[PDB]
Structure 1
Amino acid sequence: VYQEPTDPKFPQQWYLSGVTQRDLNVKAAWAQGYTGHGIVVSILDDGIEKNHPDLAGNYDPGASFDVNDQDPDPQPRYTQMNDNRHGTRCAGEVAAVANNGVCGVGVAYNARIGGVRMLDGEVTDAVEARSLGLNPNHIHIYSASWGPEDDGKTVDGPARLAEEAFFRGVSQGRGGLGSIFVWASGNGGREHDSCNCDGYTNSIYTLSISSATQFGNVPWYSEACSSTLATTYSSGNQNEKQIVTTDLRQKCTESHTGTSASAPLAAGIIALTLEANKNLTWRDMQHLVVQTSKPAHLNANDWATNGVGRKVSHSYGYGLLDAGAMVALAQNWTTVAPQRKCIIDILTEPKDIGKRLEVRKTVTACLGEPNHITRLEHAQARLTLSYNRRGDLAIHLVSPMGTRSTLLAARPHDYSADGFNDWAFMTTHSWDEDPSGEWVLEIENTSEANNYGTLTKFTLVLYGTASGSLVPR
C-alpha cells in the first residue's frame, strides 16, 4: 500500500532510498506510517527561507526566531553572494514537503520545521542561550550544524548561559522529557581536528553525528572522536553523490556537503522516532541510537568491539543511523531509569607527563550508594593539565572491560601552551558496560620534541543506571 514520494529530485536522494542497501532505511519507517506528523524541529543557523515552495507547507513560526536582529522572522539576509543559504538547505533535509512536484523530500516530510537566525552576526553566549532555549515546550528537536572554529587548534565549549540552556532544556524542556539537541561533529578533517575539543558536540546533552561518503568512506572533512554516537551519509569525492535539498531563492541544490549536512538528516530520523513514541526522554533517544546503528559497509581502520559486543569507531560512533530500526524499537521502549552520576577523583598528587604517563585506578562506581552505576551511559575524564605544546598530546582511556577510547588525538596545528582547564573529554564507546574495576588513562607526547607538563586533576565522571541490561551482542 505505501507509495514512495513522486518529487522530481527524490530519485537523486540516494541516502533516503536505494536498491543497493547503502541508505538510511527511511522508506521502512515511512511504510510503517511514520513521516514526522506532530513533531517540531528547529534549525539553529543563518535563517530559514520560510516562503520556499518546498518548506512553506511545513513551516512553523512557533519553531522560529531571529536572535541576531531580535524579532520573530528568521528570513535570511539576501546578498549577491548567497551567503545565508545554509539554514534553508538544512531545513529541507529535515522537512521538505513531499508529493508536491518540487525538489525532493525531507526525512520527516510531515514534520513542522522552523529556523533560528543566530549565525548572521556575532555569536555570543547570550545569543546561543536564547537559541538553545527557544520555545522549549513547543520545539521537540534542535539541529545545529556548526560550533567553534574547525581550525584544529581551538578548545572551546558552551560558556555559562549556553550550558545553562542545555541543562534547562534536557531537564524541563518537552514537558520534562528533555529537548533533543542534534549536533554535527565538525568539518575540521583537513586541519586534523579532534572533535572532543568542541564542547558542543563533546557534551552528553547533544546527540552527535558524523558523516560517511556514498562509497562508505570517512570523508576528507570528518573529525574522529569518542563523543560521536552515530553517522549519516553526506558528501565525499567528485565521483560520489551529495545531499539534495531546498536552497536559497526558492531553488533546489544537488550539492549540499559536510558533516553540517549530516546532522539535519539525523534530526529528521529522530523526528520519525519521536512520532513512534512521544514519551521518549532525551536519554532514551541516545539509547535507541546506540542499539540500532549499523556499522556494516562503513570503512575505518579503528572498528573495535566494546565490552557489550557492539562495534564502535571514532569516525562513525555505533555506525549509520537506521530509521526503520529506530522506529520499530521505539514503539515498545521502556523509559530508562533516572540518570545517576558517580564522581571519582582519581589523583592523590600532581603527575609529570614527560614522554608518557599512565594513571591506573580501580573504582567501585559508587557501590552501596544511590548513584551506584552498573550500566554506563557517557563517561568523562575531566582533565586539568599544563603542557608546552598542546597538539603533541594524545590521550586514551581504557575501561575495565578493555574498551580503548581515544579522548584526544595529536593535533599538528595546535601550538597552544594553555593546556586543558578541567576539560570534560567524553566517550560513548563504553555505553552499557559495567564501570567497576580498573580504568587506565594514558597521556603521551606523540612528537620527538622534549615537551613538558603536569597533570594536576583527573576526575572520572560516570553517568548511568543500575538495572535493565540486555545480554551482550
Structure 2
Amino acid sequence: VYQEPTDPKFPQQWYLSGVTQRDLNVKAAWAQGYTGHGIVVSILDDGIEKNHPDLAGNYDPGASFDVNDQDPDPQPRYTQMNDNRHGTRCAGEVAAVANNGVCGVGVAYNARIGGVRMLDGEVTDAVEARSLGLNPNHIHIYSASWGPEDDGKTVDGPARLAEEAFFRGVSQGRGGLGSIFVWASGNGGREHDSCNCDGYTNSIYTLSISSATQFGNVPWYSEACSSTLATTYSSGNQNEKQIVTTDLRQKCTESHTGTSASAPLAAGIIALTLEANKNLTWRDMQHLVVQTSKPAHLNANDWATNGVGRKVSHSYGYGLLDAGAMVALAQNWTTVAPQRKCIIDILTEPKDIGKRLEVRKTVTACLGEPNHITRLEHAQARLTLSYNRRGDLAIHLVSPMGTRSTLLAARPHDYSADGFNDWAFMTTHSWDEDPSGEWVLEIENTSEANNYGTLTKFTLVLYGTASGSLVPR
C-alpha cells in the first residue's frame, strides 16, 4: 500500500493532494508507482543551491551549467537581498527529496534535478540558446519561469539562436523524441498584459502554463491569451495558501508565489508522465495535457466549448493538470503521426484597419497534398500590420468549427506605433478540430480615438495530422 510522504511541511502542500478536490491529483500518480525515477529536469533560472538539504539527494550535475560565468557549477550568487533565490525555489517544486525530515516534497521527488545559472547577468540570445540547448540527450524537461518584461507594452520573443535551440531541441533532443520545454505564462495581469505578446509562451514548442488560486480564481498576476495550454495552482490573496519549496541558504519557504511557481509544478507532473511512458514525443505530451486537464471549479467568465466538445479559457487553457490522469493515459498512448504544416497566405491586397476589419477566407487545409490536415494542433495567424497605437487593437480568430480565439486583447499601456512584424499569434483552443472551412480574422479599435493602420500580411499556419481522432467530448 502506498505510503504518503512524512516530510514536515507535506501537510501544507494543499495543491498536491487533498480530500477537497482542489489539487493536482499527484498522490494518485505516486500510488500508481510514478515518482519521477529516471527522469531529468533542468531549471533555467538564476542558479540552484545544489547542496540544499532537500535537493542534494536528487541533484544532477549533468543537468546543470553556469552560462553567466561559463563554468559547470550553477551555485547561486549570494547577496544580502537574496535576489538569486528564484531558481532554488523552482527546483524544489519539481524534485525536493521526500521522506527525509526536511521541508516538503517535489511533485517528482525521485527525479534528477539540475539548474542552469543564466539569469544572473546579461541575458543575451546566445545565453538563452546555450541554456535551452544544454545536454539535450540527457535532460528530458526544461522549466523556465522567466521571460520578456510584463509591462503590458512589450512584444518580444526568442531571437535567432534561441529559436534555433527550440527547433533543434524538439527535432533531435531526447533521442529524436524532442526536448520538453515548460514555460510560465507571465506575471503581467495588473498591467493587462497578453501572453501572446511573449514569443516564448506563444511558441508551439513550449507548454505555456497559467495559474489558479486556492479557491479556484484567476490570480491578480495572471495573463490571459490563446497560447496558454493548461494551469497549475499558485498563490492568490492573503487568505489563500501558497507554494511550499526549498529556499536559498538551505531554508524552507511556504510563500513561493506567482507565475513562477506554476511552471515547475507542471514540469514535475510531466516528469511523472514521462516515467510512465519514456517514448512520448514533445507533441504527444501536449496531446496528453489537452485530453486530461480539468476545467471543473476554475472560475472564469470566458469558458467556451470548442468544436470537439472541450472547455477552454484564455485564463486557464484546458484547465488544471491532473497527474493521475496524465500517467494513466500515457501508459498505452499511441504515438501521434508526424507533424504536418499547411501554409495559407490569406490576403490578395493590403487592408485598411480603420475602426474594424473583418477578413473571411475559406480554406481547404492542403487538401490532396501530403500536408493535408484534418486534425489541428496549434494554429497561428502570422500578422504584419501598421497601427498608430498598438494597445488599442483587439484581434480575434474564429475557426470553421466556431471557436473564437482572442489573439490579442486591448493593452492599455501599449502606446507603440511599431505595429506587428510577422508576429505569429498562436491559439491552442482549436486543438483536434478539422480546420477545413471558413476562418474569420477580426481586428478592431477598442478606443474612441481616430486610429489608423493597414494589415499587409495574414498567413494562416496550421499544424496537425490527418488521422487518429477521438469521438468529441
Match of 1:374 in 2: 374
> Could you tell me how far 1:19 is from its partner in structure 2?
1.1
Q: Give the structure-2-normalised TM-score.
A: 1.00
- 1:187-223 CA distance string (max 9 Å, x none): 0000100100000000000011000000000000000
Match of 1:164 in 2: 164
Match of 2:232 in 1: 232
- 1:219-244 CA distance string (max 9 Å, x none): 00000000000000000000000000
- 1:361-401 CA distance string (max 9 Å, x none): 00000000000000000000000000000000000000000
Q: How does 1:48-67 map to 2 (within 5 A)?
A: 48-67=48-67
Q: For residue 426 of structure 2, give the secondary structure of its aligned residue in structure 1.
A: strand
Distance in 2, matches of 1:141 and 1:273, equals 11
- 1:160-186 CA distance string (max 9 Å, x none): 000000000000000000000000000
> Could you tell me how far 1:408 is from its partner in structure 2?
0.2
> Could you tell me how far 1:452 is from its partner in structure 2?
0.1
Match of 1:146 in 2: 146
Distance in 2, matches of 1:269 and 1:43, equals 14
> Could you tell me how far 1:249 is from its partner in structure 2?
0.2
Distance in 2, matches of 1:4 and 1:17, equals 10
> Could you tell me how far 1:17 is from its partner in structure 2?
1.1
Query: Structure 1, unaligned stretches of length 5 or more?
Result: none
- 1:61-81 CA distance string (max 9 Å, x none): 000000000000000000011
Distance in 1, matches of 2:78 and 2:92, equals 18
Distance in 2, matches of 1:403 and 1:191, equals 27
Match of 1:106 in 2: 106
> Could you tell me how far 1:285 is from its partner in structure 2?
0.1
- 1:79-107 CA distance string (max 9 Å, x none): 01100000000000000000000000000
Query: Structure 2, unaligned stretches of length 5 or more?
Result: none
Q: How does 1:296-445 map to 2 (within 5 A)?
A: 296-445=296-445
> Could you tell me how far 1:279 is from its partner in structure 2?
0.1
Distance in 1, matches of 2:326 and 2:226, equals 22
- 1:250-290 CA distance string (max 9 Å, x none): 00000000011100000000000000000000000000000
Q: For residue 328 of structure 1, give the secondary structure of its aligned residue in structure 2.
A: helix
> Could you tell me how far 1:153 is from its partner in structure 2?
0.2
Distance in 2, matches of 1:97 and 1:254, equals 16
Q: For residue 468 of structure 1, give the secondary structure of its aligned residue in structure 2.
A: coil
Runs (4+) off by over 3 Å: none
Q: For residue 442 of structure 1, give the secondary structure of its aligned residue in structure 2.
A: strand
Q: For residue 295 of structure 2, give the secondary structure of its aligned residue in structure 1.
A: coil
Distance in 1, matches of 2:199 and 2:130, equals 18
- 1:315-364 CA distance string (max 9 Å, x none): 00000000000000000000000000000000000000000000000000
Distance in 2, matches of 1:96 and 1:306, equals 38
Across the aligned residues of Structure 1 and Structure 2, the Cα RMSD in angstroms comes to 0.2
Match of 2:252 in 1: 252
Distance in 2, matches of 1:285 and 1:208, equals 12
Distance in 2, matches of 1:245 and 1:196, equals 29
Distance in 2, matches of 1:127 and 1:146, equals 13
- 1:438-473 CA distance string (max 9 Å, x none): 000000000000000000000000000000000000
Distance in 1, matches of 2:145 and 2:320, equals 18
Q: Give the structure-1-normalised TM-score.
A: 1.00
Distance in 2, matches of 1:470 and 1:267, equals 26
Distance in 2, matches of 1:25 and 1:261, equals 17
- 1:382-431 CA distance string (max 9 Å, x none): 00000000000000000000000000000000000000000000000000
Distance in 2, matches of 1:445 and 1:81, equals 44
Q: For residue 381 of structure 2, give the secondary structure of its aligned residue in structure 1.
A: strand
User: Percent of pairs identical after alignment?
Assistant: 100
Q: For residue 74 of structure 2, give the secondary structure of its aligned residue in structure 1.
A: coil
> Could you tell me how far 1:18 is from its partner in structure 2?
1.1
Q: How does 1:165-244 map to 2 (within 5 A)?
A: 165-244=165-244
